[PDB]
């Protein structure tokens, strides 16, 4: 039997602290994204990019953060899109880095271990967060300003047509778990503090933090999902699938590296991918 005791009371306090900083660290939460995806709100009405003609009109009507009418952009839509993803990822690395610092105990870790946890955690977290902005038809982009269809992304020339499909495939399965931001906040915090990343030097303080987080997550799941036992175990197993898509995505990234002109990867992304998996 579960019981309300000082231990669980602190577990709830931790869960609320993560949620609060999770909301401050990340702009478009799953709660806001779901409302947009169903029109069940305002602001909203994102421009839908579903064919090449609507892509052109979308680039004109959407205010992409990486815009600037002065910069030179590729002539291929597939590369312009790839660049947008690069920009968003770089932003996500900073949002995730900020969120990590808000995790009780993280800043007091070996700074070089903090780097290793961020290095391996960002992309697993990116694909977790990316699912919040996905349904089976497409994906929210530009902080909800736009919506780009799944089939349009598949229609991009090789090898870019295969870039996002694995992510949609993962998101469908992952979103069936029906997690909310409160569950997500702890889950990604558990990911960042995987004490089994290669290269860690001071592993004990990491596993001690992750165990505290795994307790808070399990309590969160039981309290928040009465109609689904085993949610905790299913969720842990989804990290495994995340490490695989990150691996599958590194391989895809090498095809595009030795096939496209220069295809400059942002230096931050290069640090992350250098000597990864």
């Amino acid at each position: 039997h579960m019981q309300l005791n000082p231990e669980s009371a602190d577990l709830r306090a931790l869960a609320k602290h993560l949620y609060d900083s999770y909301i401050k660290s990340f702009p478009l939460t799953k709660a806001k994204a779901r409302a947009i995806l169903t029109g069940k709100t305002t602001d909203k009405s994102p421009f839908v990019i579903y064919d090449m003609n609507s892509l052109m009109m979308g680039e004109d009507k959407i205010k992409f953060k990486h815009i600037t009418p002065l910069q030179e952009q590729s002539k291929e839509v597939a590369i312009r899109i790839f660049q947008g993803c690069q920009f968003r990822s770089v932003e996500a690395v900073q949002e995730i880095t900020e969120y990590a610092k808000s995790i009780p105990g993280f800043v007091n870790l070996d700074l070089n271990d903090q780097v290793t946890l961020l290095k391996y955690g960002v992309h697993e977290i990116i694909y977790t967060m990316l699912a919040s902005l996905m349904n089976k038809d497409g994906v929210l982009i530009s902080e909800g300003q736009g919506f780009m269809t799944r089939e349009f992304l598949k229609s991009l020339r090789k090898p870019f047509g295969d870039f996002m499909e694995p992510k949609f495939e993962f998101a469908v399965k992952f979103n069936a778990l029906e997690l909310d931001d409160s569950d997500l906040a702890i889950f990604i915090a558990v990911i960042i503090l995987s004490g089994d990343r290669p290269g860690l030097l001071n592993v004990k303080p990491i596993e001690d933090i992750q165990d505290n987080l795994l307790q808070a997550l399990e309590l969160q799941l039981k309290l928040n999902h009465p109609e689904s036992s085993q949610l905790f175990a299913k969720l842990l197993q989804k990290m495994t699938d995340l490490r695989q898509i990150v691996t599958e995505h590194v391989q895809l990234l090498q095809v595009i590296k030795k096939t496209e002109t220069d295809m400059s990867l942002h230096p931050l992304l290069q640090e992350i991918y250098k000597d990864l998996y």
Binding site: V93, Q94, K101, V115, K119, L268, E271
Partner: peptide, 10 residues
Amino acid sequence: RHKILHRLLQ
């Protein structure tokens, strides 16, 4: 190293 990542942590 991961100079950028290091910078961000600081």
